[model samples]
Target: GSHMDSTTIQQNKDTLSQIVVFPTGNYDKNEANAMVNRLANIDGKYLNALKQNNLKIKLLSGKLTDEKEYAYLKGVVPKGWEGTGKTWDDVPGLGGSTVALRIGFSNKGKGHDAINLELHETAHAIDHIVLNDISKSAQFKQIFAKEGRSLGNVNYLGVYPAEFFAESFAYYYLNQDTNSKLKSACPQTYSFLQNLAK
Candidate 1:
């Protein structure tokens, strides 16, 4: 049966003091190490928030291009978890008791695509698993409408409210208690998350 081919042949789980990274497919030492270093940005408080929310996150490091992401995740992500045209490529983070993440080196270099986005992904988990879907709150609507919205031309109604919350959540946690980029761009959302974190 097609469902009987569950094998961990080319897979390995690299455990960290506070993080666990699983490498799928063609594993590379550098990519594993990079994933460790990259994920180290998680703060204790934010991690506790996810923990309390029961979002046990696990990172999966692998080579994932826009075209290759869905194919690459077959062995890792749960079958039938993805809907048509909306695979992990569209939303790399999964929510629940154990949130799964697969962020490729595709982002290449720094900035939003690759850096400190572990929080971004987990923020998605938090959004789904949290008691209150704050992303849909009235406060969030105003905050998002004010700033945290489509930065340039990309959002194009791509779940703007959800992206708004995740972007603010990740930025606030990743950057610091106070970040010029985050605060300046979306001060209200930053203030909002700061209050929500506790």
Candidate 2:
């Protein structure tokens, strides 16, 4: 049974603003609690960044390994969507009005990686909603041009400015441990994201 008491929902809201995480299928208190606990541990700065940009997120917690879980996301996304592989920011639901994310969950111990994934997805929303898809942003383009790489280079992330923005933003959020080329190659973009949270 899929269910969440208002108290549970409010608890998640207080811990992860803009992120409303729900179980996909049958009720599993342990599973839900594990997911919520992991989600709660994400660095506060990520939520702060979205808050700074006036963005919000709705997420479902489940694993792709389960057919029901997979179907849950397929049902949520627009018809004919093969998978949530590359769509960064999305409009889910029949009429495509509800915005949501289906983040695949795993207890395989990649804790830090999961946090980075969350940040990466959040970056996509920021780019699409706040930065106007990055490619359309004059500031984004100018920064890319100043970096001296053709936007088509696909140096770090593939040729999509959206991917570049998301990946760069992730690296920036990771701070000194990032070790991503985006820091050295696109300092302007990195700096832009840096100030965006403040």
Candidate 3:
């Protein structure tokens, strides 16, 4: 009963191809292709992990108000984590299960003015699946307590271990040359993602 099936493995490619750049609002059609290309640049392991989990990405037309975003994201986020805090709309991104984003106002706290929001969320999904709760493990706690906990820019990264992992994941992958703050600050976290990026 536990035996592997070649057919099943072969059929999974269909699921692997479903990283839909779905538009839920008024987004331009071309933006989907742009989103896809952006995803194409991420770590293959993350793509595989998300694919294995059957998680898809949804690129919305515009921003979701706290009420509407919370309502829609509640249906997609892992149910166990839904009521644990405020809500999805309280934040702009959720990627533990699926990647959901609002790019209409992609110029506010989301544009080039800040770090890549999409990458950050995608990093969360990787943390949830590829790393498989390692962020919550004691090893990760020790790593964070060592350096990542002192990350620059915000207090939110220290809010939760998961958040810290996601931020470190994003910065680590963004650019080793120009964006070495993660490495300079959280060397362990930087090395972890560096090794994971193959």
Best by TM-score: 3
* lDDT measured at residue 35 in model 1 versus the true structure, 0 to 100: 52
lDDT of 1 at 92: 50
Would you estimate the TM-scores of all the predictions?
Answer: 0.59, 0.50, 0.70
lDDT of 3 by residue, 1-198 (tens): 237544443444334457655654456667555545545556555676687777777677654443353475553433234555544444455677667766542222653222666667777888887778778989888887777556654445664778788777666655555248877777788787677664
**Candidate achieving higher lDDT, 1 or 3:** 3
Model 3: per-residue Cα lDDT at residue 163:
74
Candidate 3 at 106: error in angstroms?
5.3
Worst 10 residues of 1 by lDDT: 6-15
Model 2 residue 78 lDDT score: 31
Which residue pairs collide, candidate 2? none
lDDT of 1 by residue, 44-162 (tens): 45455555554445555532323343466544433333344443445455433454555453241322342344556666666766636778878777777777553432442224677
CA error at residue 191 for candidate 2, angstroms: 1.9
Query: How many residue pairs collide in each prediction?
Result: 0, 0, 0
Off by over 4 Å in 2: 1-18, 26-56, 61-100, 103-115, 132-135, 146-158, 179-181
Ten-residue segment with the worst summed lDDT in candidate 2?
Answer: 88-97
The order by descending lDDT is: 3, 1, 2
Better of 1 and 3 by TM-score: 3
Please provide, for model 2 over 105-196, each residue's C-alpha lDDT reduced to its tens digit, 9 standing for 90 to 100. Answer: 32212321222555555566656655556555777767665653422334434434555666566566543556355567677776777676
Please say which candidate is ahead in lDDT: 2 or 3.
Answer: 3
